[PDB]
Amino acid sequence: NNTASWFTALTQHGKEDLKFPRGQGVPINTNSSPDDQIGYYRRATRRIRGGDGKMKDLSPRWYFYYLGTGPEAGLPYGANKDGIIWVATDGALNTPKDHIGTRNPANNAAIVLQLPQGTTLPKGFYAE
């Protein structure tokens, strides 16, 4: 368990935690099928030495992982845990996606996180 998300991160520049309305939020991946469109975003916080010499938090990043993969590969869909939010497209199956898995940066670039037309990013969220 030393995983890389298949996608680039969503950066939280605002004060609200990430959330999506039911049916929205699964990044587009042409190498996946309708049954696979389900997973979670996990908040990844980073700290840095600021200009004044004090440690400070950077804007949190949220990375998507297919259900049954990634840092919370053992969590069932819908499990309540701080820093974890769930997303699923209509018709997705609630089964682990080991056949998609996570990405190896040695042989695959991250896929730029894109969401379909009818879905906008929540307040304070940016796909950098």
Coordinates of C-alpha atoms in Angstrom, one line a residue:
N1 CA 0.0 0.0 0.0
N2 CA 2.0 2.9 -1.5
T3 CA -0.5 4.0 -4.1
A4 CA -0.8 6.7 -6.8
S5 CA -4.2 7.8 -8.0
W6 CA -4.9 7.4 -11.7
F7 CA -5.9 11.1 -11.8
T8 CA -4.6 14.5 -11.1
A9 CA -5.9 16.0 -7.8
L10 CA -8.7 18.5 -7.1
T11 CA -7.2 21.3 -4.9
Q12 CA -9.4 22.8 -2.1
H13 CA -8.6 26.5 -2.2
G14 CA -11.8 27.2 -0.1
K15 CA -13.0 26.3 3.4
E16 CA -15.5 23.6 2.5
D17 CA -14.8 19.8 2.4
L18 CA -15.3 18.2 -1.0
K19 CA -18.7 16.7 -1.8
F20 CA -20.7 15.8 -4.9
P21 CA -24.4 15.3 -5.5
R22 CA -25.4 11.7 -5.9
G23 CA -24.4 10.5 -9.4
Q24 CA -21.6 13.1 -9.9
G25 CA -18.0 13.3 -9.2
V26 CA -16.4 10.2 -10.8
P27 CA -13.5 11.4 -13.1
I28 CA -13.8 10.5 -16.8
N29 CA -11.6 7.5 -17.7
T30 CA -12.0 6.0 -21.2
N31 CA -10.1 2.9 -20.0
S32 CA -13.0 2.0 -17.6
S33 CA -16.5 0.7 -18.1
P34 CA -20.0 1.7 -16.6
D35 CA -19.8 -0.9 -13.8
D36 CA -16.5 0.6 -12.6
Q37 CA -17.7 4.2 -12.1
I38 CA -17.5 4.4 -8.2
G39 CA -14.9 5.3 -5.6
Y40 CA -13.8 7.9 -3.2
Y41 CA -11.8 11.0 -2.9
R42 CA -9.2 11.1 -0.1
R43 CA -7.9 14.4 1.3
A44 CA -4.1 14.7 1.2
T45 CA -2.7 17.5 3.4
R46 CA 0.8 18.9 3.0
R47 CA 2.7 21.1 5.4
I48 CA 5.5 23.4 4.4
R49 CA 8.1 25.8 6.0
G50 CA 6.5 29.2 5.3
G51 CA 8.3 32.5 4.5
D52 CA 8.2 33.5 8.2
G53 CA 9.9 30.3 9.3
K54 CA 6.8 28.7 10.8
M55 CA 5.2 25.4 9.5
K56 CA 1.9 26.0 7.7
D57 CA -0.6 23.9 5.8
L58 CA -0.8 24.1 2.0
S59 CA -4.3 23.9 0.3
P60 CA -5.6 20.4 0.8
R61 CA -5.6 18.1 -2.3
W62 CA -8.2 15.5 -2.9
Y63 CA -7.3 12.4 -5.0
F64 CA -9.8 9.9 -6.5
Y65 CA -9.4 6.2 -6.0
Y66 CA -11.7 3.5 -7.4
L67 CA -13.7 1.5 -4.8
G68 CA -11.5 -1.2 -3.2
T69 CA -8.3 0.4 -4.3
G70 CA -5.9 2.9 -2.8
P71 CA -5.1 4.0 0.8
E72 CA -8.7 3.0 1.9
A73 CA -8.9 -0.1 -0.3
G74 CA -10.6 -2.0 2.6
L75 CA -13.4 0.6 3.2
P76 CA -16.9 -0.3 2.0
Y77 CA -18.7 2.3 -0.1
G78 CA -20.4 4.9 2.1
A79 CA -18.1 4.4 5.2
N80 CA -17.9 7.6 7.3
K81 CA -14.3 8.6 7.8
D82 CA -12.8 12.1 8.0
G83 CA -11.1 13.0 4.8
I84 CA -13.0 10.4 2.7
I85 CA -16.0 11.3 0.4
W86 CA -17.8 8.9 -1.9
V87 CA -18.9 9.2 -5.5
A88 CA -20.7 6.9 -7.9
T89 CA -22.2 7.2 -11.4
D90 CA -25.7 5.8 -11.9
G91 CA -25.4 2.0 -12.7
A92 CA -22.0 1.4 -11.1
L93 CA -21.5 -1.9 -9.2
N94 CA -20.6 -1.9 -5.5
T95 CA -17.7 -4.3 -5.9
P96 CA -13.9 -3.7 -5.6
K97 CA -12.2 -2.5 -8.7
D98 CA -9.0 -4.5 -8.5
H99 CA -8.9 -4.8 -12.4
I100 CA -8.4 -1.0 -12.6
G101 CA -6.2 -0.7 -9.4
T102 CA -3.9 2.2 -8.9
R103 CA -1.3 3.7 -11.1
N104 CA 2.4 3.1 -11.3
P105 CA 4.0 6.5 -12.1
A106 CA 7.0 4.6 -13.8
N107 CA 4.8 3.6 -16.7
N108 CA 1.7 5.8 -16.7
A109 CA 1.1 9.5 -16.4
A110 CA -1.8 10.7 -14.3
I111 CA -5.0 11.2 -16.3
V112 CA -6.0 14.9 -16.1
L113 CA -9.1 14.9 -13.9
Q114 CA -12.2 15.9 -16.0
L115 CA -15.9 15.7 -15.1
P116 CA -18.8 15.6 -17.5
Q117 CA -20.6 18.7 -18.8
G118 CA -23.6 18.9 -16.4
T119 CA -21.3 18.8 -13.4
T120 CA -19.3 21.7 -12.0
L121 CA -16.7 21.6 -9.3
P122 CA -17.9 22.5 -5.8
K123 CA -17.2 26.0 -4.2
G124 CA -13.5 26.5 -3.7
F125 CA -12.5 23.5 -5.8
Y126 CA -9.9 23.6 -8.7
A127 CA -8.5 21.0 -11.1
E128 CA -4.8 22.2 -11.3

